[PDB]
Amino acid sequence: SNSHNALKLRFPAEDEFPDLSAHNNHMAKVLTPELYAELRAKSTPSGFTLDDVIQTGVDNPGHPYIMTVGCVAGDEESYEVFKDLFDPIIEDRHGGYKPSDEHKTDLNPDNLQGGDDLDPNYVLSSRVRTGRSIRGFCLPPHCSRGERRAIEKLAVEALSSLDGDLAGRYYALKSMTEAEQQQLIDDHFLFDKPVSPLLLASGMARDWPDARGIWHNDNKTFLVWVNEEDHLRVISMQKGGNMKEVFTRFCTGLTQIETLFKSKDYEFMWNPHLGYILTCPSNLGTGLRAGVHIKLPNLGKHEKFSEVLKRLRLQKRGTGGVDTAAVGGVFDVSNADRLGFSEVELVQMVVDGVKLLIEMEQRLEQGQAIDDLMPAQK
Amino acid sequence: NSHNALKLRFPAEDEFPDLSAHNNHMAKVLTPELYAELRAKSTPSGFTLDDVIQTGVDNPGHPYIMTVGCVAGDEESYEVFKDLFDPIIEDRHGGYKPSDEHKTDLNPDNLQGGDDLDPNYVLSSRVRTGRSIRGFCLPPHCSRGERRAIEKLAVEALSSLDGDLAGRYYALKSMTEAEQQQLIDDHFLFDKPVSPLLLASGMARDWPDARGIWHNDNKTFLVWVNEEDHLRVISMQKGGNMKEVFTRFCTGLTQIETLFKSKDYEFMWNPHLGYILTCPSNLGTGLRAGVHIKLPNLGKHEKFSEVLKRLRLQKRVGGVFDVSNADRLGFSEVELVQMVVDGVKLLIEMEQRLEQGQAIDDLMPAQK
């Protein structure tokens, strides 16, 4: 069953209790001596234990300013069996999302209003990314080589049946040539073995690169990663500001994949409370990041920039390409929320927020203050 | 590295540089045998010994002031080529042995006094240092992509700074006319190096791409991005409150590091060399705390040179001098600023004594 956890249970809980004195992550914030003694004996059907769940958080103290999650789920059951650890973490990480709250999924592009015309003079590209887990298999931190291979087989079979706009090709990391990895690097489609101690400490990098691969359609507007951080990572993208089109392709792609999985009696891990289940609690609900690479040289240096994004429930990341080298300010702006908002709602906020960012940019271009454009917190 | 492969087809003596009439630390240490042993090596980034000493071969230097004559291309340069750097470091940094260990101390609390040096003599005071981000090659070798990546990290980290800090970034490239003008008025604008020492090391490539300057609204904390080093942090202020200038120096610096770490990034550093920087002369603390003071009487005394060396200080407009600590490695940041505070007090004391037409010989400091 768990000979090892049985040996640990022979020690008093406080002898096995981690020293989190110099830590700063959500796990350490919630893991009291009491909670550890209560859950340490528990195990999930696949044998995943509390010690397995929090190991990364113990190894990685986290940092100042922002905390890290410090824990992972090894399977779908982990969230139920260790809900007393995950729930407060989730409540804290997702702005007060309660154990009793419900998550609503909305993958109907028609519910999105506008967003098909983000000013191409500012929006260089649009993208929507999410993650999915296949029910019946352990998550990356825990999946065996056999499970991982079974998942890849399922993913590849389904993906190979996509045609038309989604006709594509699979590229296994194991057999990848220097030439194809160079092309994938140039198209920003490649992923390598994680270097983050956060991911490494969880066990998700075992047997690399076995059963890991990259798939993408011929037009390079739809990309799928298999067995990296989660079973599947699905990305839709393209040049320009047609977020609606990107989202539609995103939704239709996910839908066709799921139908194909359904054909084989397989389905994505999902429930009314946590939405789509993924390895890290920070990616629950929709696990969706919808963003744009937008030119904002003026606003980008403005003192209220960060403040404007926070109020629009958006977040930014800087870029390191020739684009920003010229403009002197190209940013990657996406939605900050993940759980408690539907996919349509998250994408809508990017659409809405982007329009205001552009209006503020043009306002600044004409050398005028944007004071009366400052929005109220959303 | 296959260019080095070709060079290795010639015997070492045929590739060995002609360093006659060269007055730099590299030239005073590199022997034909040391070259023959190290010329086939390379750091993971591919930096070679030839790359390390190129600036020292190109720049004979000056008969008087001596230069280091070499640069590090990445963090591993100081290790893979330690047999060349160690002797140079011992030579450049007052005997600092390979066995010695550097001790960093950025706690402004350990700074005894320095809160108010006589304003009648000290026009202004400032402290500055350099920093390298682990994982990226140094300015002599960094690719355009690395430089841009470094710039991305620095800007968002500096964006997160706030309080008496919190400022605006200014990319040299896309800098607007009004902006460039405004910066010159604040005396913050820096441009492409004219120094043949930097040019020869390959540090000005792609200028001004990925280069910029960030400073606070208050104009007391400044940071140069991707110039002589990944980062050049400066703290300044008119007056003689070196203590306050150093405090702001330490905090703003602790925060930057804070933000960097919060993304799995850290400054290059190790117990032996302190902070890793491009030029060996900047190792350890790479710190320079200086003040502009009026020492007219001393300025023309025959013991002014000896007095500075005694106090371990350096000088570089009525008696207006630029005095700063001379040491960089083997002394903590707190120790370096303390010597400047102590020595300055002693300099002003001697200046006054001279004004009264008195001795001062009894004030000759004991070689610190």
UniProtKB/Swiss-Prot annotation, chain A:
Biased composition (Basic and acidic residues): 93-107
Chief place of localization: cytoplasm
GO cellular component: cytosol; extracellular exosome; extracellular space; mitochondrion; plasma membrane
Crosslink position(s): Glycyl lysine isopeptide (Lys-Gly) (interchain with G-Cter in ubiquitin): K42, K98, K104, K378
Keyword Metal-binding tagged: no
PROSITE patterns in alphabetical order: PHOSPHAGEN_KINASE, PHOSPHAGEN_KINASE_C, PHOSPHAGEN_KINASE_N
UniProt cross-references to Pfam families, sorted A to Z: ATP-gua_Ptrans, ATP-gua_PtransN
Keywords associated with the record: ATP-binding, Cell membrane, Cytoplasm, Isopeptide bond, Kinase, Membrane, Mitochondrion, Nitration, Nucleotide-binding, Phosphoprotein, Transferase, Ubl conjugation
Substitution effect: R289 to H/L/Q: Complete loss of activity
Phosphagen kinase N-terminal domain span: 8-95
Enzyme Commission number(s): 2.7.3.2
Amino acids binding creatine: V69, E229, S282
Record-listed 3'-nitrotyrosine modification sites: Y266
Enzymatic reactions: creatine + ATP = N-phosphocreatine + ADP + H(+)
Residues where Phosphoserine is found: S1, S196, S306
Subcellular location: Cytoplasm, Cytosol; Mitochondrion; Cell membrane
Residues binding ATP, per UniProt: 125-129, 188, 233, 289, 317-322, 332
CDD domains listed in its UniProt record: creatine_kinase_like
GO MF annotation list: ATP binding; creatine kinase activity; ubiquitin protein ligase binding
Annotated phenotype, changing C280 to S/Y: Complete loss of activity
Assembly information from the UniProt record: Dimer of identical or non-identical chains, which can be either B (brain type) or M (muscle type). With MM being the major form in skeletal muscle and myocardium, MB existing in myocardium, and BB existing in many tissues, especially brain. Interacts with SLC12A6 (via C-terminus); the interaction may be required for SLC12A6 potassium-chloride cotransport activity.
Domain notes: The internal MTS-like signal (iMTS-L) mediates targeting to mitochondria thermogenic fat cells.
Function (record text): Reversibly catalyzes the transfer of phosphate between ATP and various phosphogens (e.g. creatine phosphate). Creatine kinase isoenzymes play a central role in energy transduction in tissues with large, fluctuating energy demands, such as skeletal muscle, heart, brain and spermatozoa. Acts as a key regulator of adaptive thermogenesis as part of the futile creatine cycle: localizes to the mitochondria of thermogenic fat cells and acts by mediating phosphorylation of creatine to initiate a futile cycle of creatine phosphorylation and dephosphorylation.
Protein's UniProt name: Creatine kinase B-type
Organism expressing this protein natively: Homo sapiens (Human)
Lineage, opening ranks: Eukaryota, Metazoa, Chordata, Craniata, Vertebrata
